[PDB]
Design an enzyme around this catalytic site. Structure first.
Site, short mmCIF file in Angstrom:
data_model
loop_
_atom_site.label_atom_id
_atom_site.label_comp_id
_atom_site.label_asym_id
_atom_site.label_seq_id
_atom_site.Cartn_x
_atom_site.Cartn_y
_atom_site.Cartn_z
N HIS A 41 0.81 -1.22 0.00
CA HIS A 41 0.00 0.00 0.00
C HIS A 41 0.85 1.28 0.00
O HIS A 41 0.28 2.37 -0.06
CB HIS A 41 -1.02 -0.04 1.16
N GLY A 143 2.90 5.69 9.70
CA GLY A 143 4.28 5.62 9.29
C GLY A 143 5.02 4.38 9.76
O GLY A 143 6.13 4.13 9.29
N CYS A 145 4.11 1.33 9.17
CA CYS A 145 3.93 0.20 8.27
C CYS A 145 5.27 -0.26 7.70
O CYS A 145 6.17 0.54 7.45
CB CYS A 145 2.98 0.55 7.14
#
Ligand code: T0W
Ligand code: T0W
Lengths: 305, 305
Positions: A41, A143, A145
């Site tokens: 993503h 942030g 991820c």
């Protein structure tokens, strides 16, 4: 003596963290050999997130659109591929800090350490468990991820988790390093049912053994039980059923303490039925289920890496 | 979101750990620049430990009696000095992995991460607090002496603790990196009074703010209190007195949440007087005092190093 929620030393993993930017989105990647792994993503925008068509989004991207930075140094991207929910960015330099490593898909109830990272820089490390419903109860901000979960066995890091998503309920979901989600989850910004969670019975028993080894004794009683009788109680209190395989993995702790597994089950039964009467066990006023039997044996025997 | 007992990433400290052997005794040392720091009781034998004469024991030792090994490589010892309760071994090679670092003596109630080590190899990392009575509640086995506690601020490691001793009560005692014990303790194998411990009030309040930020709301009430009224309650429950300096350091969390510090004190008063009625806050059924206000701001704002 003493018993703490201990994480693995994080140095081997710190040297693998990078920053990955695609457009306006920045998150963390994992640099092993000449491949960087990150959540797919990174290629989305806010228009995209209710139901991204990841195949269409990725087709608009080229190698030079993926900005990969390790500390101060920029990496050169020479290929890209989507595998399930992760992106694999081939780079022209092998990471000189690559440890010996494996990718593993863990089972619910197993534990691992998380290195929480932002912009490719580590922030902190903590230990957690994969819930029976395949969520984790982490500490992740936007942030984070691409932060990963791992175990270490001597010189080998076994990567088991990459962080992708916070569900609207505030619990966390992610993938193995082949990009397959744990649980029913998809990488879309939607309400998603996690389904009934339960307490990890074999871990609670391991922790009660840890307590005895360290001098908390007060919950031991004059009783025993059977696996059937115990599991009738476990069901009532939303505990996982205990199997003989669980009894077997608790064997070493039973042998160390001299307390038969079914006797310890009878102590746990009484705690479930009566609560703790305002007492504590190993600094906790609830029954702790985030230590596996193998965690207890390591922390009690001092294994190093 | 989510809130975890998070440790600092340990990589910078892992690269400083060595093994120090003197005679039959092996423990851990800290290799910074061209000096290795370790507990002076590495020079004791079991005959020695009720009341070692450390000056006499060290006089019998020479540089070549201190065996210092970093992973596989042996270090050459070219000087030795005793400073308080630590030994400083000058070696002929500066540690190439030395981070930017400071030695600090922390205050009771402050927190730090511990890298538990055995034979110079890291085993695990966990977060803890220096108790008001200058003990720590760690997880240490025999051979862990010389493991260190630390904080990190951007690229600088502040070393604050070196582990020396487990008291007969099962709690832990150690020194700053100049070898001065925290608390009344001495490096002798004796019963030693730790004196009355208390709960770190400003940390409990910080954690209640962390709970509100993360969605645990249920303990907020319609009440307020005064600093006097609150501190009368704190005394009754063996909590540290709250000062205006504590109120000041809680300012940022008050501002973030909109809940005045004295209103949060009134919520804490009610929890102390009424307990939690079988409820939980951030996964805990007791009042947690091992997060400072600055810990809560970092974990909630995602600061990296
Ligand atoms: C913005 C991306 N999404 C949703 C998403 C979109 C596509 O696939 C998943 C996240 O939930 C990212 N995320 N992960 N942990 C977090 C903790 C706090 C805030 C945001 C957090
Ligand atoms: C043998 C040395 N002494 C006593 C001592 C002698 C001189 O000064 C202090 C310790 O207590 C070492 N120690 N430290 N953490 C431990 C955890 C479990 C078992 C032993 C542990």
């Amino acid at each position: 003596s003493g018993f703490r929620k201990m994480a693995f030393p994080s140095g081997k993993v710190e040297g693998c963290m990078v920053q990955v930017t695609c457009g306006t989105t920045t998150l963390n990647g994992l640099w092993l050999d000449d491949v960087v792994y990150c959540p797919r993503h990174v290629i989305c925008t806010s228009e995209d997130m209710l139901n991204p068509n990841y195949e269409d989004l990725l087709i608009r991207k080229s190698n030079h659109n993926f900005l990969v930075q390790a500390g101060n140094v920029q990496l050169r991207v020479i290929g890209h591929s989507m595998q399930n929910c992760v992106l694999k960015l081939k780079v022209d330099t092998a990471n000189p800090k690559t440890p010996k490593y494996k990718f593993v898909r863990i089972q619910p109830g197993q534990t691992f350490s998380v290195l929480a990272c932002y912009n490719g820089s580590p922030s902190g490390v903590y230990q957690c468990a994969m819930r029976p419903n395949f969520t984790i109860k982490g500490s992740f901000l936007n942030g984070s991820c691409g932060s990963v979960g791992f175990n270490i066995d001597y010189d080998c890091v076994s990567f088991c988790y990459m962080h992708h998503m916070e569900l609207p309920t505030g619990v966390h979901a992610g993938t193995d390093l082949e990009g397959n989600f744990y649980g029913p989850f998809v990488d879309r910004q939607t309400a998603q049912a996690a389904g009934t969670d339960t307490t990890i019975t074999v871990n609670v028993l391991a922790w009660l053994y840890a307590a005895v080894i360290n001098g908390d004794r007060w919950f031991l009683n004059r009783f025993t039980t059977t696996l059937n009788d115990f599991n009738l109680v476990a069901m009532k209190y939303n505990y996982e059923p205990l199997t003989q395989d669980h009894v077997d993995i608790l064997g070493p702790l039973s042998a160390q303490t001299g307390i038969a597994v079914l006797d310890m089950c009878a102590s746990l039964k009484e705690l479930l039925q009566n609560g703790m009467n305002g007492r504590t066990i190993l600094g906790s006023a609830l029954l702790e289920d985030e230590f596996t039997p193998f965690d207890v044996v390591r922390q009690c025997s001092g294994v190093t890496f």
